[PDB]
Amino acid sequence: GSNEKPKVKKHITSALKKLVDKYRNDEHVRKVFDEIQQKLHCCGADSPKDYGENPPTSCSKDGVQFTEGCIKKVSDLSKAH
């Protein structure tokens, strides 16, 4: 019944890994991961290969490719204050 299990910020790495995997599973995830990928200038969860060989447009911008992950990128700004 009563069960409160919080999630640590570091857990974001676990969710991201699943997000990139469930990209073609949920539409809401695409638009979300897409906006986050651009704003964070990253591809996939831990890498662009997570998509295979054809990542979303959010992976590129202005004709450029983002050779950086999201799990690490999110941390860069996360720790930054």
Tab-separated table of N, CA, C and O in Angstrom:
chain	number	residue	atom	x	y	z
A	1	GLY	N	0.806	-1.206	0.000
A	1	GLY	CA	0.000	0.000	0.000
A	1	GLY	C	0.842	1.260	0.000
A	1	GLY	O	1.171	1.796	-1.059
A	2	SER	N	1.190	1.738	1.191
A	2	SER	CA	1.996	2.947	1.324
A	2	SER	C	3.454	2.670	0.971
A	2	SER	O	4.166	1.995	1.713
A	3	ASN	N	3.891	3.199	-0.168
A	3	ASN	CA	5.264	3.009	-0.620
A	3	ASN	C	5.763	4.238	-1.374
A	3	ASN	O	5.264	4.561	-2.452
A	4	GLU	N	6.750	4.917	-0.800
A	4	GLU	CA	7.316	6.111	-1.418
A	4	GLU	C	8.769	5.879	-1.821
A	4	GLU	O	9.670	5.901	-0.981
A	5	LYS	N	8.990	5.654	-3.112
A	5	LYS	CA	10.333	5.417	-3.628
A	5	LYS	C	10.752	6.530	-4.585
A	5	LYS	O	10.421	6.520	-5.769
A	6	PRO	N	11.500	7.512	-4.059
A	6	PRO	CA	11.981	8.649	-4.849
A	6	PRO	C	13.050	8.242	-5.859
A	6	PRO	O	13.560	7.122	-5.821
A	7	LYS	N	13.385	9.158	-6.760
A	7	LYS	CA	14.395	8.897	-7.779
A	7	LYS	C	15.485	9.962	-7.751
A	7	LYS	O	15.203	11.156	-7.848
A	8	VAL	N	16.732	9.522	-7.618
A	8	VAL	CA	17.867	10.439	-7.580
A	8	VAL	C	18.155	11.013	-8.962
A	8	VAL	O	17.875	10.381	-9.980
A	9	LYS	N	18.718	12.216	-8.990
A	9	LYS	CA	19.048	12.878	-10.247
A	9	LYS	C	19.912	11.979	-11.125
A	9	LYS	O	19.748	11.943	-12.344
A	10	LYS	N	20.831	11.253	-10.497
A	10	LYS	CA	21.718	10.351	-11.221
A	10	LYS	C	20.923	9.287	-11.969
A	10	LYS	O	21.380	8.750	-12.978
A	11	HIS	N	19.727	8.989	-11.471
A	11	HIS	CA	18.865	7.991	-12.094
A	11	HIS	C	18.491	8.408	-13.514
A	11	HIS	O	18.064	7.582	-14.321
A	12	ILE	N	18.653	9.693	-13.811
A	12	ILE	CA	18.332	10.218	-15.131
A	12	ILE	C	19.005	9.399	-16.227
A	12	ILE	O	18.486	9.278	-17.337
A	13	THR	N	20.166	8.833	-15.907
A	13	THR	CA	20.911	8.024	-16.864
A	13	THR	C	20.138	6.765	-17.238
A	13	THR	O	20.179	6.318	-18.384
A	14	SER	N	19.433	6.197	-16.265
A	14	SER	CA	18.652	4.987	-16.492
A	14	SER	C	17.430	5.283	-17.356
A	14	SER	O	17.095	4.518	-18.259
A	15	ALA	N	16.768	6.399	-17.071
A	15	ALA	CA	15.585	6.799	-17.821
A	15	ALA	C	15.941	7.156	-19.260
A	15	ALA	O	15.241	6.771	-20.198
A	16	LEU	N	17.033	7.894	-19.428
A	16	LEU	CA	17.483	8.304	-20.755
A	16	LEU	C	17.739	7.090	-21.642
A	16	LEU	O	17.299	7.042	-22.790
A	17	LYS	N	18.453	6.107	-21.100
A	17	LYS	CA	18.766	4.891	-21.840
A	17	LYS	C	17.495	4.232	-22.366
A	17	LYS	O	17.471	3.708	-23.480
A	18	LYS	N	16.439	4.264	-21.561
A	18	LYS	CA	15.163	3.674	-21.946
A	18	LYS	C	14.409	4.586	-22.908
A	18	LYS	O	13.717	4.117	-23.812
A	19	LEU	N	14.548	5.893	-22.708
A	19	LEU	CA	13.881	6.872	-23.559
A	19	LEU	C	14.275	6.681	-25.020
A	19	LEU	O	13.417	6.554	-25.894
A	20	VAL	N	15.579	6.661	-25.279
A	20	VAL	CA	16.087	6.483	-26.633
A	20	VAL	C	15.632	5.151	-27.220
A	20	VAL	O	15.494	5.012	-28.436
A	21	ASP	N	15.398	4.176	-26.349
A	21	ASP	CA	14.957	2.855	-26.780
A	21	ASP	C	13.464	2.857	-27.095
A	21	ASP	O	13.012	2.177	-28.016
A	22	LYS	N	12.703	3.626	-26.323
A	22	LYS	CA	11.262	3.717	-26.518
A	22	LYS	C	10.905	4.921	-27.385
A	22	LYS	O	9.775	5.410	-27.350
A	23	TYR	N	11.874	5.393	-28.161
A	23	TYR	CA	11.663	6.539	-29.036
A	23	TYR	C	10.596	6.237	-30.082
A	23	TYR	O	9.722	7.061	-30.351
A	24	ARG	N	10.674	5.048	-30.672
A	24	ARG	CA	9.717	4.634	-31.690
A	24	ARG	C	8.537	3.897	-31.060
A	24	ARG	O	7.742	3.268	-31.757
A	25	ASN	N	8.431	3.982	-29.738
A	25	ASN	CA	7.351	3.322	-29.015
A	25	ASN	C	6.268	4.324	-28.621
A	25	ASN	O	5.077	4.018	-28.677
A	26	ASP	N	6.692	5.519	-28.227
A	26	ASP	CA	5.760	6.567	-27.828
A	26	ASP	C	6.052	7.867	-28.569
A	26	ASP	O	7.192	8.331	-28.602
A	27	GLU	N	5.016	8.450	-29.164
A	27	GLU	CA	5.164	9.696	-29.908
A	27	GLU	C	5.595	10.832	-28.984
A	27	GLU	O	6.468	11.629	-29.329
A	28	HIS	N	4.978	10.899	-27.809
A	28	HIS	CA	5.297	11.937	-26.836
A	28	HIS	C	6.784	11.919	-26.490
A	28	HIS	O	7.371	12.955	-26.179
A	29	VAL	N	7.385	10.735	-26.548
A	29	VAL	CA	8.803	10.583	-26.242
A	29	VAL	C	9.670	11.180	-27.344
A	29	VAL	O	10.747	11.714	-27.080
A	30	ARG	N	9.193	11.085	-28.581
A	30	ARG	CA	9.925	11.615	-29.725
A	30	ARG	C	10.049	13.133	-29.635
A	30	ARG	O	11.148	13.683	-29.695
A	31	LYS	N	8.912	13.806	-29.493
A	31	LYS	CA	8.889	15.261	-29.396
A	31	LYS	C	9.693	15.737	-28.189
A	31	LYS	O	10.346	16.779	-28.238
A	32	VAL	N	9.641	14.965	-27.107
A	32	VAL	CA	10.366	15.307	-25.890
A	32	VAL	C	11.868	15.124	-26.074
A	32	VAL	O	12.648	16.054	-25.868
A	33	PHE	N	12.268	13.919	-26.464
A	33	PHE	CA	13.678	13.612	-26.677
A	33	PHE	C	14.258	14.471	-27.798
A	33	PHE	O	15.459	14.738	-27.831
A	34	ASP	N	13.395	14.900	-28.713
A	34	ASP	CA	13.821	15.729	-29.835
A	34	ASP	C	14.197	17.130	-29.364
A	34	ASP	O	15.250	17.655	-29.725
A	35	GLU	N	13.328	17.731	-28.556
A	35	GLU	CA	13.569	19.072	-28.037
A	35	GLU	C	14.768	19.083	-27.094
A	35	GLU	O	15.563	20.023	-27.095
A	36	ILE	N	14.890	18.032	-26.290
A	36	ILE	CA	15.991	17.921	-25.342
A	36	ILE	C	17.313	17.680	-26.060
A	36	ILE	O	18.361	18.165	-25.634
A	37	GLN	N	17.257	16.929	-27.156
A	37	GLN	CA	18.451	16.624	-27.935
A	37	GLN	C	19.021	17.887	-28.573
A	37	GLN	O	20.238	18.055	-28.657
A	38	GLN	N	18.135	18.770	-29.020
A	38	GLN	CA	18.552	20.016	-29.651
A	38	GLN	C	19.075	21.004	-28.614
A	38	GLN	O	20.191	21.509	-28.730
A	39	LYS	N	18.261	21.274	-27.599
A	39	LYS	CA	18.641	22.201	-26.539
A	39	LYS	C	19.941	21.762	-25.872
A	39	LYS	O	20.738	22.593	-25.436
A	40	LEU	N	20.149	20.452	-25.799
A	40	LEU	CA	21.353	19.902	-25.186
A	40	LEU	C	22.409	19.593	-26.243
A	40	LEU	O	23.540	19.228	-25.919
A	41	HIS	N	22.033	19.744	-27.509
A	41	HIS	CA	22.948	19.484	-28.615
A	41	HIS	C	23.587	18.104	-28.478
A	41	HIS	O	24.803	17.957	-28.604
A	42	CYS	N	22.759	17.097	-28.220
A	42	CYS	CA	23.243	15.731	-28.065
A	42	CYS	C	22.406	14.761	-28.893
A	42	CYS	O	21.349	15.121	-29.412
A	43	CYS	N	22.886	13.527	-29.013
A	43	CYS	CA	22.183	12.504	-29.778
A	43	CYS	C	21.897	11.280	-28.914
A	43	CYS	O	22.726	10.872	-28.102
A	44	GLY	N	20.715	10.697	-29.096
A	44	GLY	CA	20.339	9.526	-28.326
A	44	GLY	C	20.542	9.720	-26.836
A	44	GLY	O	20.783	10.837	-26.377
A	45	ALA	N	20.445	8.633	-26.080
A	45	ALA	CA	20.619	8.689	-24.634
A	45	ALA	C	22.096	8.758	-24.262
A	45	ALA	O	22.572	9.775	-23.757
A	46	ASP	N	22.816	7.671	-24.513
A	46	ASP	CA	24.240	7.609	-24.205
A	46	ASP	C	25.078	7.752	-25.471
A	46	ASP	O	26.301	7.874	-25.409
A	47	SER	N	24.410	7.737	-26.621
A	47	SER	CA	25.093	7.860	-27.903
A	47	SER	C	24.094	7.837	-29.055
A	47	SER	O	22.955	7.392	-28.914
A	48	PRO	N	24.530	8.329	-30.225
A	48	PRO	CA	23.689	8.377	-31.425
A	48	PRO	C	23.417	6.990	-31.998
A	48	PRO	O	22.427	6.778	-32.697
A	49	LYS	N	24.304	6.047	-31.697
A	49	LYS	CA	24.160	4.679	-32.179
A	49	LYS	C	22.915	4.022	-31.590
A	49	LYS	O	22.428	3.016	-32.108
A	50	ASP	N	22.403	4.597	-30.508
A	50	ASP	CA	21.213	4.070	-29.851
A	50	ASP	C	20.043	3.992	-30.827
A	50	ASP	O	19.114	3.208	-30.636
A	51	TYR	N	20.095	4.811	-31.872
A	51	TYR	CA	19.038	4.837	-32.876
A	51	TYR	C	19.358	3.890	-34.028
A	51	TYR	O	18.468	3.465	-34.763
A	52	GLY	N	20.638	3.564	-34.180
A	52	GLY	CA	21.055	2.670	-35.244
A	52	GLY	C	21.963	3.349	-36.250
A	52	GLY	O	23.177	3.414	-36.056
A	53	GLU	N	21.374	3.857	-37.329
A	53	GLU	CA	22.140	4.532	-38.370
A	53	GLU	C	21.326	5.660	-38.999
A	53	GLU	O	21.625	6.113	-40.103
A	54	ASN	N	20.295	6.105	-38.289
A	54	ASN	CA	19.436	7.178	-38.777
A	54	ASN	C	18.713	7.864	-37.624
A	54	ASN	O	17.519	7.662	-37.398
A	55	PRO	N	19.450	8.697	-36.873
A	55	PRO	CA	18.899	9.431	-35.731
A	55	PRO	C	17.926	10.523	-36.158
A	55	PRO	O	17.831	10.879	-37.333
A	56	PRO	N	17.183	11.069	-35.184
A	56	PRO	CA	16.203	12.129	-35.436
A	56	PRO	C	16.863	13.453	-35.809
A	56	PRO	O	18.043	13.670	-35.530
A	57	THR	N	16.094	14.335	-36.441
A	57	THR	CA	16.605	15.636	-36.852
A	57	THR	C	17.162	16.410	-35.662
A	57	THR	O	18.006	17.292	-35.823
A	58	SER	N	16.684	16.074	-34.469
A	58	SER	CA	17.131	16.740	-33.251
A	58	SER	C	18.608	16.459	-32.990
A	58	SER	O	19.259	17.162	-32.215
A	59	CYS	N	19.131	15.425	-33.640
A	59	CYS	CA	20.530	15.047	-33.478
A	59	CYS	C	21.441	15.996	-34.251
A	59	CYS	O	22.613	16.162	-33.912
A	60	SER	N	20.895	16.617	-35.292
A	60	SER	CA	21.660	17.546	-36.115
A	60	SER	C	21.032	18.936	-36.091
A	60	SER	O	19.863	19.097	-35.737
A	61	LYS	N	21.816	19.939	-36.469
A	61	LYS	CA	21.339	21.318	-36.493
A	61	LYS	C	22.223	22.184	-37.385
A	61	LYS	O	23.448	22.173	-37.259
A	62	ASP	N	21.595	22.934	-38.282
A	62	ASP	CA	22.324	23.809	-39.193
A	62	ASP	C	23.267	23.003	-40.081
A	62	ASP	O	24.289	23.512	-40.541
A	63	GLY	N	22.916	21.743	-40.319
A	63	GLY	CA	23.742	20.887	-41.151
A	63	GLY	C	24.935	20.327	-40.403
A	63	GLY	O	25.945	19.968	-41.008
A	64	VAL	N	24.820	20.252	-39.080
A	64	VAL	CA	25.897	19.732	-38.247
A	64	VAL	C	25.422	18.555	-37.405
A	64	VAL	O	24.233	18.429	-37.113
A	65	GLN	N	26.358	17.695	-37.017
A	65	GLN	CA	26.034	16.527	-36.207
A	65	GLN	C	26.595	16.670	-34.796
A	65	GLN	O	27.739	17.086	-34.611
A	66	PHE	N	25.782	16.321	-33.803
A	66	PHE	CA	26.197	16.411	-32.408
A	66	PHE	C	26.868	15.117	-31.955
A	66	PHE	O	26.207	14.096	-31.762
A	67	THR	N	28.186	15.168	-31.788
A	67	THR	CA	28.947	14.002	-31.360
A	67	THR	C	29.062	13.947	-29.840
A	67	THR	O	30.141	13.711	-29.299
A	68	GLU	N	27.942	14.166	-29.159
A	68	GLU	CA	27.918	14.141	-27.702
A	68	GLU	C	26.654	13.457	-27.189
A	68	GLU	O	25.597	13.534	-27.814
A	69	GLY	N	26.772	12.788	-26.047
A	69	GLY	CA	25.632	12.099	-25.470
A	69	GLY	C	24.738	13.026	-24.670
A	69	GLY	O	25.054	14.203	-24.491
A	70	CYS	N	23.618	12.496	-24.188
A	70	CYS	CA	22.675	13.285	-23.405
A	70	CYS	C	22.865	13.035	-21.912
A	70	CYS	O	22.799	13.962	-21.104
A	71	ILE	N	23.104	11.778	-21.553
A	71	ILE	CA	23.305	11.408	-20.158
A	71	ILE	C	24.438	12.217	-19.532
A	71	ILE	O	24.369	12.603	-18.366
A	72	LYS	N	25.479	12.470	-20.317
A	72	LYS	CA	26.627	13.235	-19.844
A	72	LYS	C	26.369	14.734	-19.968
A	72	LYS	O	26.736	15.512	-19.088
A	73	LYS	N	25.735	15.132	-21.066
A	73	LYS	CA	25.425	16.537	-21.305
A	73	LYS	C	24.532	17.093	-20.200
A	73	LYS	O	24.809	18.153	-19.640
A	74	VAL	N	23.461	16.369	-19.891
A	74	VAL	CA	22.529	16.789	-18.852
A	74	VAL	C	23.247	17.006	-17.525
A	74	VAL	O	22.867	17.872	-16.736
A	75	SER	N	24.288	16.216	-17.285
A	75	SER	CA	25.059	16.320	-16.051
A	75	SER	C	25.920	17.580	-16.054
A	75	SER	O	26.076	18.241	-15.027
A	76	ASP	N	26.478	17.905	-17.214
A	76	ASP	CA	27.323	19.085	-17.353
A	76	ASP	C	26.599	20.333	-16.857
A	76	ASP	O	27.158	21.128	-16.101
A	77	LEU	N	25.354	20.500	-17.289
A	77	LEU	CA	24.553	21.652	-16.890
A	77	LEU	C	23.932	21.433	-15.515
A	77	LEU	O	23.745	22.379	-14.750
A	78	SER	N	23.617	20.179	-15.206
A	78	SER	CA	23.015	19.836	-13.923
A	78	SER	C	23.884	20.325	-12.768
A	78	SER	O	23.415	21.043	-11.884
A	79	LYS	N	25.152	19.930	-12.781
A	79	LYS	CA	26.089	20.328	-11.737
A	79	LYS	C	26.382	21.824	-11.809
A	79	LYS	O	26.697	22.453	-10.799
A	80	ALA	N	26.274	22.386	-13.009
A	80	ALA	CA	26.524	23.808	-13.211
A	80	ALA	C	25.429	24.654	-12.569
A	80	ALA	O	24.240	24.372	-12.724
A	81	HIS	N	25.838	25.693	-11.847
A	81	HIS	CA	24.892	26.580	-11.181
A	81	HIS	C	25.197	28.040	-11.503
A	81	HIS	O	26.180	28.344	-12.180
